[PDB]
Design a protein around this ligand. Structure first.
Ligand SMILES: [Cl-]
Ligand SMILES: [Cl-]
Ligand SMILES: [Cl-]
Lengths: 6, 238, 240, 6
């Protein structure tokens, strides 16, 4: 699970 | 020594490699966080502490798995590179305090600064292109390297690997702009260059950030916390 | 608030001005010292702390209305005060510097060398500084108004930051510049080596507290062969 | 009194 800024 | 892998197989494995490293070597700032994304401060270790970064996933298949970067933790500086097939640590002249056991250490006449590397590489970072293929080309140059004096192609290789490892660890902006290349060319912008040259000043200002107004460091302006989190991932511990 | 004078009347008054500031805001490193000369580390103050520097002695044989506001933790010039109009002109990257009892003009311009050299149309490498050009810089700053730096104001800032804050940090710059204060008024020309020092102060500050014993240290292209080379070059470092 | 590096 990544973040929206990645 | 502590050991991390950066896996270039896919965009996903690359981003998850960097996130895993960040979670282990840095601690989130409470006041600069949204969701699972934060700006983090490098954990303070004793002087001269370093970790190894093993490079994996550069192409298909066993292949291209003999490159290891040695990174000084407190400043994320690349101290040099290890050819694990020949067991040789090529160490920059400004890192003679980095001692790696069990390897042959070659003390190089060249320092690690961008000014030196760009001069020897005949390549300016602003406008430099980085693709998967140029990382494979860089890997091949570093594996073929020997002696104690940096060459043009070894200097180009260090410039590209430093960008996509240490500078990407520091700057989420660089990670996000480069990772498409692992799926296109990444072209380092003047803006990217200006970030890397102001990492210390940025690191000095962000821990004082409260609430959510702007932040200005020289020509670098952050209008909001989203602008900060979109740009900076890891800062120096002062 | 702390208050210091930097007196440009003579080489002697200028050097003693810089040494009094260093003794008051910093503490000598134990391992980088020889005689009374040392590399010193800036003493920790609360974030946002600043001190004032009053400029004097520009004319040996007047010009006493310029004050610089210096953030203490990083020796950065946050702006300049016209004491005749009681107005503080503050760079856009120093909105956390709050000075009571002055009118604060928040400027659109930041303090970086890239910005200042653009507006000034002047490169620091090869920049000349003489006594007459510090008097000229004083007058540009006393004439300044509004919230956007001009060419003349930016040249003045580049010159005053060099001979105050950068000379405070770097004994090399102090030593090379003080000649311009003598009775024939020679010209100080800033060298590429001077500029490189100022661009590497942070990194230099990070390595020197670890220096032990004798012999060399290298930070990028900056190479010190021995403690005398260090002391001849660096006077004050960040506290990290 | 100054130092020898000043
Ligand atoms: Cl592999
Ligand atoms: Cl910086
Ligand atoms: Cl050395």
């Amino acid at each position: 699970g990544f973040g929206l800024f990645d | 020594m502590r050991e991390f892998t950066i896996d270039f197989s896919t965009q996903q494995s690359y981003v998850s490699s960097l996130n895993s490293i960040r979670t282990e070597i840095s601690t989130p700032l409470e006041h600069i966080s949204q969701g699972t994304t934060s700006v983090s401060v490098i954990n303070h270790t004793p002087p001269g502490s370093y970790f190894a970064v093993d490079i994996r996933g550069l192409d298909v298949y066993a292949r291209f798995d003999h490159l290891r970067l040695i990174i000084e933790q407190n400043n994320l500086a690349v101290a040099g590179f290890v050819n694990t097939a020949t067991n040789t640590f090529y160490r920059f002249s400004d890192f003679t305090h980095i001692s790696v056991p069990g390897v042959t250490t070659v003390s190089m006449t060249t320092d690690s600064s961008y000014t030196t590397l760009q001069r020897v590489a005949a390549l300016e970072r602003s406008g430099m292109q980085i693709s998967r293929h140029s990382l494979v080309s860089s890997y091949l140059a570093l594996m073929e390297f020997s002696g104690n004096t940096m060459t043009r192609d070894a200097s180009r290789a260090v410039l590209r690997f430093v960008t996509v490892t240490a500078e990407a660890l520091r700057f989420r902006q660089i990670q996000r702009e480069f990772r498409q290349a692992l799926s296109p060319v990444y072209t380092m912008t003047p803006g990217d260059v200006d970030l890397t040259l102001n990492w210390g000043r940025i690191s000095n200002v962000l821990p004082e950030y409260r609430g959510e107004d702007g932040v200005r460091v020289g020509r670098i302006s952050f209008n909001n916390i989203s602008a900060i989190l979109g740009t900076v991932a890891v800062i120096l511990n002062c």
